[PDB]
Design an enzyme around this catalytic site. Structure first.
Site, PDB file in Angstrom:
ATOM      1  CB  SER A   1      -0.968   0.051   1.180  1.00  0.00           C
ATOM      2  OG  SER A   1      -1.993  -0.896   1.008  1.00  0.00           O
TER       3      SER A   1
ATOM      4  CE  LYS B   1      -4.272   1.013  -0.549  1.00  0.00           C
ATOM      5  NZ  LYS B   1      -4.272   0.136   0.663  1.00  0.00           N
TER       6      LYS B   1
ATOM      7  CB  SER C   1      -4.464   1.585   4.328  1.00  0.00           C
ATOM      8  OG  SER C   1      -3.444   1.118   3.467  1.00  0.00           O
TER       9      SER C   1
ATOM     10  CD  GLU D   1      -4.544  -2.523  -3.091  1.00  0.00           C
ATOM     11  OE1 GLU D   1      -3.738  -1.576  -2.856  1.00  0.00           O
ATOM     12  OE2 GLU D   1      -4.363  -3.690  -2.673  1.00  0.00           O
TER      13      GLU D   1
ATOM     14  CB  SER E   1       1.387  -5.012   5.695  1.00  0.00           C
ATOM     15  OG  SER E   1      -0.024  -5.076   5.783  1.00  0.00           O
TER      16      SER E   1
END
Ligand SMILES: O=C(Nc1cccc(-c2nnn[nH]2)c1)c1ccc2n[nH]cc2c1
Length: 263
Positions: free
Chosen positions: A45, A48, A105, A141, A212
């Site tokens: 992430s 992002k 997140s 994702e 993660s």
């Protein structure tokens, strides 16, 4: 040459059992400290940031883009969507999706950013436009977090990511307004207190983005304002040999502490 700081980071890595990547840029003097700085790591992430920044860049030529609605459908929900699930069968603006992706997140929010850019390659294309030849986003994702050792997909190096984060948050990769918005978003992160931040003196301030994934992959990228000196940019990436390994945010904190002590 191997510095004292690099030796300490090697000792931390050895005791961790994993693979640690660190890149510091000290904007006091533009000097860099690198540990495995040119090895590839799964971003998870931390990617992002690039996606949100790419949308901020688009917004420079469209004053209303950040207020544009995007439909959230039940089928859009993935595995971690604390904000988007509140808006299913309704809409969120691109600002709301950026804030949710960065500060919470949210993976559905990230997918909407990616879609706005035309897919993962649109995020890579923006990276290239701002001088990052290393970053690559290949998947959406949740699969971009598989973090398989040796897999080039959805990776970067610590050196490239630190340089990019500097250009985005402190330099001129974005317009002034957009840079300020990105910094505001990063400073309002909710997920970061156990990672790089945990290793820094409490008087300092920072903004960060965690990540993660599988292989116990545990990441953080931060822009830091230390007490009494110019800002730092710090990337800490960590990954482990077993697919089901636990997260190790404490290793990122330990790396940050070694960096802070070495200034
Ligand atoms: O989305 C994941 N993780 C996730 C989701 C949302 C946020 C975060 C995160 N943000 N900051 N630190 N972790 C991490 C995740 C993990 C393992 C996977 N294996 N295969 C697909 C996977 C997806």
């Amino acid at each position: 040459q191997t510095s004292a700081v690099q030796q300490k980071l090697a000792a931390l890595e050895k005791s961790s059992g994993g693979r640690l990547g660190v890149a510091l840029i000290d904007t006091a003097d533009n000097t860099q400290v690198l540990y495995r700085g040119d090895e590839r790591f799964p971003m998870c992430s931390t990617s992002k940031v690039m996606a949100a920044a790419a949308v901020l860049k688009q917004s420079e030529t469209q004053k209303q883009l950040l207020n544009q609605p995007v439909e959230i459908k039940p089928a859009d929900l993935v595995n971690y969507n604390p904000i988007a699930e509140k808006h299913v069968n309704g809409t969120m603006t691109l600002a709301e999706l950026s804030a949710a992706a960065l500060q919470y997140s949210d993976n559905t929010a990230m997918n909407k950013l990616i879609a706005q850019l035309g897919g993962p390659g649109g995020v890579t294309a923006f990276a290239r436009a701002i001088g990052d030849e290393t970053f690559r986003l290949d998947r959406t994702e949740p699969t971009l977090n598989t973090a398989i050792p040796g897999d080039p997909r959805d990776t970067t190096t610590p050196r490239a990511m630190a340089q990019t984060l500097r250009q985005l948050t402190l330099g001129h990769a974005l317009g002034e307004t957009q840079r300020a918005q990105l910094v505001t978003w990063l400073k309002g992160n909710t997920t970061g207190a156990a990672s790089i931040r945990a290793g820094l003196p409490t008087s300092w301030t920072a903004g960060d983005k965690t990540g993660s994934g599988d292989y116990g992959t545990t990441n953080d990228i931060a822009v830091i304002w230390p007490q009494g000196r110019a800002p730092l940019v710090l990337v800490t990436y960590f990954t482990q040999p077993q697919q089901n390994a636990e997260s190790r945010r404490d290793v990122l904190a330990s790396a940050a502490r070694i960096i802070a002590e070495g200034l």
